[PDB]
Design an enzyme around this catalytic site. Structure first.
Site, PDB file in Angstrom:
ATOM      1  N   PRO A 258       0.839  -1.198   0.000  1.00 49.88           N
ATOM      2  CG  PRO A 258      -0.682  -1.548   1.711  1.00 49.88           C
ATOM      3  CD  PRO A 258       0.706  -1.952   1.254  1.00 49.88           C
TER       4      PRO A 258
ATOM      5  CG  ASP B 163       4.422  -1.440   6.377  1.00 53.62           C
ATOM      6  OD1 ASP B 163       3.479  -2.049   5.806  1.00 53.62           O
ATOM      7  OD2 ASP B 163       4.541  -1.341   7.624  1.00 53.62           O
TER       8      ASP B 163
ATOM      9  CG  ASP C 189      -0.583  -5.044  12.338  1.00 56.30           C
ATOM     10  OD1 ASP C 189      -1.518  -4.672  13.105  1.00 56.30           O
ATOM     11  OD2 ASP C 189       0.636  -4.767  12.496  1.00 56.30           O
TER      12      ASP C 189
END
Ligand SMILES: [Cl-]
Ligand SMILES: [Cl-]
Ligand SMILES: [Cl-]
Ligand SMILES: [Cl-]
Ligand SMILES: [Cl-]
Ligand SMILES: [Cl-]
Ligand SMILES: [Cl-]
Ligand SMILES: [Cl-]
Ligand SMILES: [Cl-]
Ligand SMILES: [Cl-]
Ligand SMILES: [Mg+2]
Ligand SMILES: [Mg+2]
EC number: 2.4.1.-
Lengths: 312, 313, 313
Positions: free
Chosen positions: A9, A92, A178
């Protein structure tokens, strides 16, 4: 079928995103065998993030969401639906992969029939450590290898396990989703491996209604595990997770903090209601120094929590 | 009338009894002046215990109860009814008497018009007397419950004046196994005033909470109804000193942070709390101050506060 | 119109009183610019206090109350009614003024348009006075928090009389202690200009040989109704700094682990609790952090937690 889909993302990352993307495109693994799926959560930085991404057109798969979701869950789920690879790896957007990461982790996983491969974490700037203290572990154990202390999704997950059990990132809370993903994964899979030869992944540095709904789900995942089916084993896992929650939970020292009184009460009320759905049989597996704090939480007694923190 | 009756309950002791009975028959006191009364609590060891007892026919007195009663209380009460001596002494079935015990304690009692004589003693293995404060000041002709730390020595291995027991109908209770000996000594102490302590020798060698707190409740009742210690403030002082002893040496004193199940902890504390709350708070100022928090936490029936109190101790 | 009325209550002071009256009559201020008002709380020392006072007849104004009241509040109020001066200064009958007290305090007050002037205290014999208020030297325009005025709330100060008159400020009889604190707080909350003078020991405290929380409650009420400190956050700050003062130096501050009887101790806590629970929690952020647990325990009305909080400090 690719070996690995890297799911990443983005949101308002800008030029720093070149180093991340570059780290992924320059893997030792053959580019035939992996893909980078980039899901932009509707960046709003006057085009700067989308402009970086566009320089890699033809080398990545890309999707932009219409509306910003405000957390990595929806973009991660989108990436999951787009992947048809053997394994997925969540990256990430600030972070870096070592050049050997995908090849070394996949190979170790293949060798050891792994459902989950955890690569050692490094850092740039000023991450778990106990999980990596024994070097490589071919068939790790949740408790002996301190996996409850390394529950990020910055790991290599076998996609068939996600698909068969319909594991998805929950959206009801903005935080701990998560952790829940990783817990649901651990409770529905058998074989975990830990790989340490290099620093494979480099990290570049509420009332509680949502957060405790998520913690509630963690305990539920343990007690309904089709892998760990023995009730005493479930008590043990639950007790060890409680220990982790008291040592590293969000706002663990709320009781003596500068939080407003009514907020402390609402927080503890949520923490109390959640822990009181967890059998007291798990309590004997919690580290002894936390006996009073845990009981204080069960009794929903703010003064006793305050005192317990002063004595810890 | 004999000087002393030694009263000894038995159950399934068998050949071990030999050492105990021998120690009682080998006294310096003239054998005409005392008797050993053995009360067997219906042993079921294939006749072994009763076989041992019968090898002393004519040298001891005995009786076997028809049913096993469960604890030493009913056998001891039975020995009490059989005794016509001036003092009684309770000896358990694995204990040893020093050969000078009956003579030395009796004579010292007689000299000092004692309702109660307490001899120094020790525990098997040790080869020395117990380290209790009661024995650390040497011979005491007229002792005090507080000054001579008698609440820390509440066993019934003492020589008790029989008229005190008979006139006040003092009996062992069957409320609980634990603390029945303490209660008897407390009832006796609260009904007498002349207490002697003799320490020239190691005179003997010894080996939910609902019932237990019922016994502790009877202890406080005994103190607050004492027809000897009638002053209300003296009663408060005696109760407070007993509270201290209970917090220092009571059963499961550190239950709060123990591995006991929560439900058991709550049950235990609730019994403890209901019992202590029948004790006037006027007694609390006589409890040693380090226990101020723990005591209040028990009165308030607050488990977290007991846990905390124990962590600070 | 006099510059200053010194108001002095008396009761059974006797011969000692000469030295106090003499200190007032011996001022650098012109004798016609001030007056000493003596109010005797119906002394009964066989005319002796009266005899001393009568030696100064014509140099003082004097009123004898017809029956004793037992406190400084009624005489002081009597004194206020009698004064027509610009400033009043309350003097305890044990104490002494420096010869430059009235002149220096009045002149500083005039220079700085002061409602309140506070002169440095000295002390004679063991038996202390506040210090922090005086450790910033001469302060023309002082602030309650920054100049530690909550730590010096006696009425041994120079008060502008118009402030007292227009706000009808009077000494109360709620409690044995802290009635002088309430008077000064009510004054502070109705005035803006305060001065502190430290060039001399202007006032010597001489060490010679019952609803407290009603008073504390009235202190918080005065803050939260102040027509001077109108801003709600400022009121919260003043309230929290006072709470801090209360926990550091209040009456019976360590009551929880004290030898106070339970019935008295539980009353104390409950009265403290219900008083502080009328104070907004917005004030608690201004209380020193070490008191976080103790303060919350009082708010919760939890004696065990207050006991524990005191053990941890
Ligand atoms: Cl663990
Ligand atoms: Cl963690
Ligand atoms: Cl992690
Ligand atoms: Cl299993
Ligand atoms: Cl957490
Ligand atoms: Cl004692
Ligand atoms: Cl004993
Ligand atoms: Cl019991
Ligand atoms: Cl201020
Ligand atoms: Cl002052
Ligand atoms: Mg508590
Ligand atoms: Mg003059």
């Amino acid at each position: 079928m690719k070996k690995v889909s890297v799911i990443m993302p983005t949101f308002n990352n800008g030029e720093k995103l070149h180093r991340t993307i570059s780290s992924v495109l320059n893997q030792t693994m053959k580019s035939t065998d992996y893909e980078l799926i980039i899901i932009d959560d509707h960046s709003n930085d006057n085009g700067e993030t989308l402009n970086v991404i566009k320089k890699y057109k033809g080398l990545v798969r890309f999707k932009q969401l219409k509306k910003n979701s405000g957390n990595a869950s929806v973009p991660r789920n989108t990436g999951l639906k787009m992947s048809k690879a053997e394994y997925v790896f969540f990256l990430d957007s600030d972070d870096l992969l070592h050049e050997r990461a995908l090849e070394d982790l996949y190979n170790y996983g293949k060798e050891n029939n792994s459902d989950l491969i955890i690569g050692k974490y490094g850092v740039e700037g000023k991450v778990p450590k106990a999980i990596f203290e024994k070097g490589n572990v071919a068939k790790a154990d949740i408790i002996d290898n301190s996996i409850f202390y390394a529950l990020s999704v910055l790991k290599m997950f076998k996609k068939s396990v996600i698909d068969k059990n319909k594991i998805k990132f929950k959206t009801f809370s903005k935080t701990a989703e998560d952790q829940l993903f990783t817990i649901e994964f651990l409770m529905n899979s058998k074989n975990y491996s830990i790989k340490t030869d290099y620093e494979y992944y480099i990290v570049v540095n509420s009332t509680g209604n949502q957060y405790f709904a998520t913690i509630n789900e963690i305990y539920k995942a343990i007690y309904k595990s089709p892998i760990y089916k023995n009730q005493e084993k479930r008590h043990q896992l639950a007790g060890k997770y409680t220990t982790r929650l008291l040592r590293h939970g969000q706002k663990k020292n709320f009781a003596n903090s500068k939080m407003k009184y009514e907020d402390k009460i609402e927080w503890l009320n949520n923490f109390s209601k959640t822990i009181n759905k967890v059998p007291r049989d798990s309590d004997k597996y919690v580290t002894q120094i936390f006996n009073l704090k845990l009981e204080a939480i069960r009794q929903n007694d703010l003064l006793a929590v305050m005192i317990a923190d002063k004595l810890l």
